[PDB]
Design a protein around this ligand. Structure first.
Ligand code: CA
Ligand code: CA
Ligand code: CA
Ligand code: CA
Ligand code: CA
Ligand code: CA
Ligand code: CA
Ligand code: CA
Ligand code: CA
Ligand code: CA
Ligand code: CA
Ligand code: CA
Ligand code: CA
Ligand code: CA
Ligand code: CA
Ligand code: CA
Ligand code: CA
Ligand code: CA
Ligand code: CA
Ligand code: CA
Ligand code: CA
Ligand code: CA
Lengths: 616, 608
């Protein structure tokens, strides 16, 4: 997964990430609540003034940056309840025996002159006997408490500028200076409780992210090395520590994220600074109204143009990246996977295609993941290989070619093909997969899409065009009396089957179970499915399709005009070709994808060509 | 006067200035009205969010950026009424026979792709019987109509960027490109009405100031050279034309003003860019909450530091610089005079001393003018020479030394000396001038200050009365004086030394062997030392005076007199006429009878 951390594995890293985000969100006390609500209603163009009014004053369902407005919800109570729902309770200065400054919330404040506007939350997770099992340390980003917002933010910005232009390793030392004493009290508290450093989660966003990186940097030599093995997840940090301890997560179109290299100010710092970085997720796009807008992007992308800062906002971090965590495609992703997150306002969502524009970034490589919202989305895949997820809502998908998985989610979803039905072939395994094959042999595996839209020659002999909506049914695509037939098929069962192709060619659908698929002299398309499947060509120009946890298969009779297609399979690093996955075992080429494999019986690896082995 | 232009008088230059400002304000249609009102009430600190709310939504008494809010005033109608009050009526596309774009307000829009977010107002001044007497051309800054504010702003910022980073002559050519056709129609209209180029006033603020400079640069060669002799007054322009035609007015702490050199982007563009410029007023400070704030100023002064743009806002230009125009000290000023304008919010005004911090600027020289607000101000002069003007409200003044004029204005005003009454001498002429001389010899001439505060080891408040400074029944006597009348008087000092006040009229002041202080006043006064170590004080329109018996240990003091350029000394004003040194200050003069110019020392001659 994109958020794998150390050696915790897929599932445990996701749980750690969700805790990091929860404590980070808590540290801002819903300061951006009004902004997120105004944006969602008004967007970022014509509605920008109205969005900014809500950012300041909230409304009846949000609280902006100004406190004490009687019709706003108590957004700070809501942030406290949300952090507790995630399992966390702030730890008091009294429980720590801490002598420094806290406010009425329990937020701890920086310890030295020049750091007095630094804030950190210290939180505890407790088991059912009320024993402490985990400590959360969440540094606040730029900003402070509503009571002192402006003066506190000035002090933060002075710190931000010293990171770039002050003493060498100002950023490294930030946490030592701001919270050196507090962190000794935390070590004592942890030890008193049977905890070590491994039981400590360290997080924060922006300046809070720089703080995560500072702390990792210092954890080797300060506080007795107690935190050397702590967990460090930083959001939208301008800096990266010199250690291997930090997961630096952010949106690539967030101008603050990676602004420094890893604390050095460069030419790039004021512009696009999207060079690959080892500790960082380099290719996650926030598809918001600004990113989508032609007008807004006439302006140079820069940390110095404030409207680009919409991509920095913490709520869209929490909301977008939670959708990545929940994605049915999550375990296909890796640290530098290209992921586009649908983050449009309500008005923009209704008329803007979520797609990879590749704006203000280095060229995206490998497959592209596009993650929709729980509302009605318009999602556009490119001409390469895409993983499109609609989620809830009535979603519409388009795609420009290649090999794709398209998950409609709940709702009434539609695939608009934008061309004639006659240029496509359609197959259906009866297990909820509708396969769509374009004129170039590109295949989309689709689920939960009930309507197919095509564009057909229309009046005056094709001068005008008809949009035709087809319903996906068991017997084919139907418009009124007109049925578009599925491609000839043989369907198996979820037990062990033997299926035989007819001579004109069939799609063979083994489904679950160890299946024997016998092709003929025709062009057959082999879908072994789950289980360990034996598949024999029979001759012709065959396609073998591998998706998900496809097991250990054997392919007999594979020749030069045949094709393997790996779609939604484990372990594909961005832009892998087959050689990254291929080895000879005796007489056979073996291709491995996670714990799944395909054995090409009798085929020399040296005869194989990227033409006939599609890895998406 | 600081806004002197070409060869126009002081008064004519002022009239031109006030029209330029009025048309410049009109061109923005009160867009920043909500910001000004929120700032006035809430400040720029702790209350900045509430300021920003007002900047967007306005209130019961102002209109922010958002249109159609019913409890807001119709600020655009108010902008139209205001420009008409100043004598101006927008000229229609129809009267000009113009075929390009206007909006419902009569604003003209740029003519070519890349310039479509440019705006300009074309206005007419009509005489009693109603013929065209003047044309006004007001180029809009960054921003446009409330209806399409964001998109129109984005276009303007592209224009702004191209002025710094695009073709070399991009800023020079801006007006040619945006409004070349329109301006040919303006020429035809002006001819049709018996007007030449000298009858055209050209103004605007920010990008509109850039436009003013572009039009002047283009005016010799384009539109038949019709506009070459036009009047060009630009506010807060990042650029300066290559010609000598443009008066570039701005606040020195406005980071847009002079950001470019005249259109070149330099290292200084993104920090402090306060090098002296021939076309520009270099030393006018907007003393606002940002400028005053220690916290704010821990951040870099930079056009890229957006909160610094508070000093760029047009309402503070019009309001602050209108107070300069109205100042009793106006005619003492010149283009590069140091002038501090009180521009604080209500809350900051209560606890903040308006003073020359000299922040983010090259070193100020010469005398300093501090212009107050019509509310209660706290005003602090420096250790050098100051002209302090309270205007209305109850004002409190401090001053650090030197030679000063302090104008209390209306209200109950106070001068807080922060030292013991015993370390000062006080004199009063009976004609509203209270003279305060400090232990170092520095003199302050004060008017409409009825209270003096001193420290007596411990504040003590003295009333200024005809018989002395009073604390209840207790009196600090004025220095020995002989008061004249507004007729011609002969006044003679006693041997102990006196302040001699001729007042109006041609007086004969006869000092004695003691230390006298001679104040001839208005009129041509004859003043004779009589011996001792004498001081001769000259202020305002002091006439042509003769000084007899002036020697080595005597002092001349010129304070609030004409023709003093920043940091002038006496040599710029002295010559020999026969056997006498004559010192000349505008139309006024002092003849030192029998005194050789080479015998004079700048320690003996104070020029403020
Ligand atoms: Ca802070
Ligand atoms: Ca990376
Ligand atoms: Ca990238
Ligand atoms: Ca695709
Ligand atoms: Ca959706
Ligand atoms: Ca859906
Ligand atoms: Ca089966
Ligand atoms: Ca199977
Ligand atoms: Ca076959
Ligand atoms: Ca299989
Ligand atoms: Ca074959
Ligand atoms: Ca404009
Ligand atoms: Ca100058
Ligand atoms: Ca200056
Ligand atoms: Ca002074
Ligand atoms: Ca006042
Ligand atoms: Ca006053
Ligand atoms: Ca007299
Ligand atoms: Ca006189
Ligand atoms: Ca004498
Ligand atoms: Ca003498
Ligand atoms: Ca006189």
């Amino acid at each position: 997964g994109v958020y794998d951390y150390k050696n915790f594995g897929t599932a445990d890293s996701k749980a750690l990430f969700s805790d990091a985000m929860a404590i980070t969100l808590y540290s801002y006390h819903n300061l951006d609540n009004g902004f997120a609500a105004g944006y969602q209603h008004n967007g970022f163009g014509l509605g920008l003034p109205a969005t900014l009014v809500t950012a300041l004053l909230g409304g009846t369902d949000s609280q902006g940056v100004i406190p004490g407005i009687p019709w706003n919800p108590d957004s700070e109570k809501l942030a406290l309840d949300a952090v507790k729902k995630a399992g966390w309770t702030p730890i008091t200065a009294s429980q720590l025996g801490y002598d420094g400054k806290t406010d009425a919330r329990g937020t701890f404040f920086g310890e030295k002159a020049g750091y007095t506007t630094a804030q950190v939350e210290i939180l505890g997770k407790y088991d059912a006997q009320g024993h402490l099992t985990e400590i959360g340390i969440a540094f606040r980003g730029t900003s402070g408490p509503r009571e002192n917002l402006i003066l506190d933010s000035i002090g933060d910005v002075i710190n931000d500028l010293l990171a770039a232009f002050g003493p060498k390793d100002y950023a490294k030392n930030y946490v030592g200076e701001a919270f050196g004493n507090l962190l000794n009290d935390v070590v004592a508290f942890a030890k008193a409780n049977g905890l070590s450093g491994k039981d400590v989660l360290v997080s924060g966003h922006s300046l809070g992210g720089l703080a995560v990186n500072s702390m990792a940097d210092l954890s080797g030599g300060k506080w007795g090395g107690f935190f050397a093995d702590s967990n460090y997840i930083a959001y939208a940090s301008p800096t990266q520590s010199s250690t291997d301890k930090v997961l630096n997560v952010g949106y690539e179109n967030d101008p603050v994220f990676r602004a420094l290299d890893g604390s050095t100010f460069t030419g790039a710092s004021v512009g696009v600074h999207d060079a690959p970085k080892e500790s960082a997720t380099d290719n996650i796009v926030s598809f918001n109204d600004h990113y989508a807008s032609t007008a807004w992007n006439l302006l140079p992308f820069s940390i110095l143009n404030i409207p680009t800062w919409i991509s920095h906002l913490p709520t869209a971090y929490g909301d977008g990246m939670n959708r990545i965590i929940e994605s049915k495609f999550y375990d296909l992703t890796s640290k530098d996977s290209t992921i586009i997150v649908a983050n449009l306002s309500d008005p923009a969502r209704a008329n803007t295609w979520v797609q990879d524009l590749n704006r203000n970034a280095e060229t995206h490589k490998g497959s592209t993941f596009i993650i929709g919202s729980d509302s009605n989305d318009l999602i556009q895949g490119g001409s390469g290989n895409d993983y499109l997820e609609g989620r809830a809502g009535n979603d519409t998908f388009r795609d420009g070619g290649g090999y794709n998985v398209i998950l409609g989610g709940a709702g009434n979803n539609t695939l608009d093909l934008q061309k004639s039905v006659n240029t496509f072939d359609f197959a259906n395994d009866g297990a909820g997969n509708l396969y769509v094959r374009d004129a170039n042999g590109g295949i989309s595996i689709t689920r939960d899409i009930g309507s197919i839209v095509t564009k057909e020659p229309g009046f005056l002999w094709g001068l005008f065009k008809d949009d035709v909506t087809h319903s996906v049914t068991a017997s084919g695509l139907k418009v009124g009396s007109n049925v578009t037939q599925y491609d000839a098929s043989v369907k198996g069962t979820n037990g062990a089957d033997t299926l035989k192709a007819h001579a004109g060619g069939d799609w063979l659908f083994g489904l679950d179970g160890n299946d024997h698929l016998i092709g003929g002299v025709g062009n057959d398309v082999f879908v072994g499915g789950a289980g360990n499947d034996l598949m024999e060509s029979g001759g012709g120009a065959d396609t073998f399709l591998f998706n998900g946890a496809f097991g250990q298969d054997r392919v007999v009779g594979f020749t030069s005009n045949d094709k393997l297609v790996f779609l939604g399979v484990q372990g594909v690093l961005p832009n892998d070709d087959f050689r990254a996955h291929a080895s000879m075992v005796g007489q056979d080429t073996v291709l491995k994808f996670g714990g799944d494999s395909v054995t090409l019986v009798g085929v020399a690896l040296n005869s194989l060509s990227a033409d006939g082995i599609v890895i998406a």
